[PDB]
Design a protein around this ligand. Structure first.
Ligand SMILES: Nc1ncnc2c1ncn2[C@@H]1O[C@H](COP(=O)(O)OP(=O)(O)OP(=O)(O)O)[C@@H](O)[C@H]1O
Ligand SMILES: Nc1ncnc2c1ncn2[C@@H]1O[C@H](COP(=O)(O)OP(=O)(O)O)[C@@H](O)[C@H]1O
Ligand SMILES: [Ca+2]
Ligand SMILES: [Ca+2]
Ligand SMILES: [Ca+2]
Ligand SMILES: [Ca+2]
Lengths: 372, 144, 372
């Protein structure tokens, strides 16, 4: 009778809603804001801690902290504030009545899973709970049981091979640059035009500039040559105090850090050949359909032209005796939530819940034997 | 590899034959016998063939078939039900993905008469929502 | 046979002289003074604008403008007046037969760099010019090649780590908090004792008060308790109209904006966190000698007790196995000029000069390729 809840806890953007929906009901950033000045107009609703999109609204007078960094929960009390804001203010439901599905990053440590279980059953008192993985729900939302998933959000980029509906832990590879580092690099390369963005309040402005005006160049050098010669790609943005900035060759230079990590001084590999390094670690027989199923998921896959560039870069260094196709659904920024919403609403999922009494005579250790 | 105890899975893969299931609103219903070999273009299907060997063991083969008009929930449910039916078995089955119009030749080999497609199908289990939508038009008088 | 000129144009002071010398010949503040009152006596010597020490000697009847505000150059006509004054009146030399070395802060907007070229070959017609980073000149003046430079002057405060004589661009950090901001903060907190300073001449007087009577406390709260409990820390200063003011705890509160930027309302961290995060963004093997070679430059690092406070703050942040050496030479006010003077006088330097010929076949873009 009751309806399950799906809550995908991103490192920079948390999604929540009810199972059986085609879209998440609530998308809001996972930030906790604290005031940096003194509230002299007393009795006019000042709070010690502003949580979520409200903290995005009055972001000038606050300092912002992210409770999840690099996909892993580090600050736990702020994560309780995120979950309290999610249940009580945002979705407006009592957690005692609704089962809750959560998603975790691949290669999550066990202690974070146990602590997630403990604050889920003690503090909020859910009647049922389950934990799932980002990439397998992305692959289920794509309608596949075998494929590579490039899940690149705000904290990390994960390459996860999945064969027969289960991941391969020996070939899951983690590359630690995402849209946070792209935002920081864009704050770096807007300094030569004379614009300065230093504090965490206007990092969100640079993130909005990155979302509205960026694209992946198919070839970099001729794009730089045409940017240097002409001015057909220089466009303007309106800052929310009224000043207008203009951006030229930085529109396409900022996505290129994914393909060239040396732009930020990172000595690791670009996003195209780390998928090759993951797929060489798999068995020789299963590479045929694994090359054919290139699932892109996450918000930093939403640049225009990233799929064609990824097709070119895989096709360059894979052998010519096979076909490469890149798939990119339009809903790939919500695809983990879509896979969770399909998973929670099935007729075989009611026995896969972790009920309250099983946690009572099992403690916070039954989450390993059931979420597996 | 946690097993599931769905009550319709108990009649799956016990005798050599060929079994078809249709997805209707996050659940499997077996289509009747004289509706075999033909499919709706807007639904998702789970196909099982089990084959007896000479040495006594009984092999399995899963396919999951997606039309060109099926929704996201039907195809996702077909993939997850394929995975869970493999996990109900002892991992002895191989899975295949079948797309309408681009089927494998071995998938054409299973049906004697051939493949024929009709329009329509069962409706999706999803209900449409938009993220962060409010449609509000109110007026309040504060007084005192 | 021609002697090159070295002209360090800071935000608050201009240090100009000849290459090969040990001390700069002309040191004068970079201000332009204009009359604001009505001239009633005819003839005499009234000029439309006063530059340098002549503006300081007549600052009671002048409004004073700084051409450089926070490192960038805002007024270019006034900066041309500054360059004309330092060539023709201070050094008293014709600049059409002397190559001129100029200095520049890093992470500057690019549009200054050709514009500094655009005056120098067109108005003064120098035979050659070169632009050098201030931090590498400060490190060369100490006799070192690897180390971290904290350069803090009147406009900006930047941490630059240098390895093998080249600055690492992915770890240079800029903080817009320097001597003019401390002067403005001291004008703000002298109103607590009843002293009003609003005029630009009064800003110059408060800058002099800050130079004579300020120091960095080793620990802030104990020093505040000491200043509250007695009056042993109070000092007296004589204003030029004979008035005597007394300052107490404001002696040490004004340097503490360097270590706690929230006094003037900035979310950004202090100089010691800036040094620690600048070191932490380098490679793991070269962190040993970056902690052990930590030089300081600029006039804002001339307070008493700044080196002991910096070593106390870095030592608490670094691992305990590391060895910390804060290096504070007594000539660090002019270390940029000394490094430029030695670097320009070398016999192996006369091929990095950007001469007239490659400039007027290449346009104002040669400075982006020859000056790294
Ligand atoms: N159209 C877009 N173009 C570029 N970047 C985008 C776009 N839309 C969203 N992003 C970026 O994608 C990120 C959010 O994506 P997503 O919600 O999938 O990640 P997440 O779940 O928060 O992260 P992670 O999975 O790493 O924990 C942010 O960095 C955001 O700036
Ligand atoms: N003895 C001192 N104590 C504190 N501050 C000083 C002292 N001498 C100079 N300063 C400050 O140093 C600043 C100028 O430093 P410097 O780097 O030499 O010039 P610029 O910033 O123009 O390059 C001035 O703003 C002045 O306030
Ligand atoms: Ca995610
Ligand atoms: Ca349908
Ligand atoms: Ca199997
Ligand atoms: Ca300086």
């Amino acid at each position: 009778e009751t309806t399950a809840l799906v809550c995908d806890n991103g490192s920079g953007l948390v999604k929540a809603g009810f199972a059986g929906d085609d879209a998440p009901r609530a998308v809001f950033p996972s930030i906790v804001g604290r005031p940096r000045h003194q509230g002299v107009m007393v009795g006019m609703g000042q709070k010690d801690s502003y949580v979520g999109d409200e903290a995005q609204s009055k972001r000038g007078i606050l300092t912002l902290k992210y409770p999840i960094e690099h996909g892993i929960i580090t600050n736990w009390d702020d994560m309780e504030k995120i979950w309290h804001h999610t249940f009580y203010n945002e979705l407006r439901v009592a957690p005692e009545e609704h089962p809750t599905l959560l998603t975790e990053a691949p290669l999550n440590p066990k202690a974070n899973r146990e602590k997630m279980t403990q604050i889920m059953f003690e503090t909020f008192n859910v009647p049922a709970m389950y934990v799932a993985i980002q990439a397998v729900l992305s692959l289920y939302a794509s309608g596949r049981t075998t494929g590579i998933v490039l899940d690149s959000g705000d904290g990390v980029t994960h390459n996860v091979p999945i064969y027969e509906g289960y991941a391969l832990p020996h070939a899951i590879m983690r590359l630690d640059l995402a849209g946070r580092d792209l935002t920081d690099y864009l704050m770096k390369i807007l300094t030569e035009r004379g614009y300065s963005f230093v504090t965490t309040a206007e990092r969100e402005i640079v993130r909005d500039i990155k979302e509205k005006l960026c694209y992946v160049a198919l070839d970099f050098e001729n794009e730089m040559a045409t940017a240097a010669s002409s001015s057909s790609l220089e466009k303007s943005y309106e800052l929310p105090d009224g000043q207008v900035i203009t951006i030229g060759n930085e529109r396409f230079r900022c996505p290129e850090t994914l393909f060239q990590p040396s732009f930020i001084g990172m000595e690791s590999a670009g996003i195209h050949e780390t998928t090759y390094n993951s797929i060489m670690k798999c068995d020789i027989d299963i590479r045929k359909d694994l090359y054919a199923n290139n699932v892109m998921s996450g918000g930093t896959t939403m640049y225009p032209g990233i799929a064609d560039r990824m097709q070119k870069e895989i096709t360059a260094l894979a052998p010519s005796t096979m076909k490469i196709k890149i798939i990119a659904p339009p809903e790939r920024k919500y695809s983990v939530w879509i896979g969770g919403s399909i998973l929670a609403s099935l007729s075989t999922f009611q026995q896969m819940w972790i009920t309250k009494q099983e946690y009572d005579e099992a403690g916070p250790s039954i989450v390993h034997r059931k979420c597996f | 590899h946690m097993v599931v105890e769905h009550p319709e899975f108990l009649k799956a893969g016990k005798e050599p034959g060929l079994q078809i299931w249709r997805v209707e609103k996050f659940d499997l219903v077996p289509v009747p016998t004289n509706l075999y070999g033909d499919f709706f273009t807007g639904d998702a299907y789970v196909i099982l063939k089990t084959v007896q060997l000479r040495n006594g063991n009984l092999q399995y083969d899963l396919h999951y078939w997606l039309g060109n008009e099926c929704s996201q929930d039907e195809s996702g449910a077909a993939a997850i039900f394929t995975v869970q039916l493999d996990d109900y078995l002892n991992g002895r089955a191989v899975q295949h993905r079948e797309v309408q119009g681009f089927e494998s030749a071995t998938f054409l080999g299973y049906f004697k008469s051939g493949l024929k497609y009709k329009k329509g199908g069962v409706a999706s289990g999803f209900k449409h929502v938009v993220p962060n939508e409010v449609v509000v038009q109110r007026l309040f008088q504060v007084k005192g």
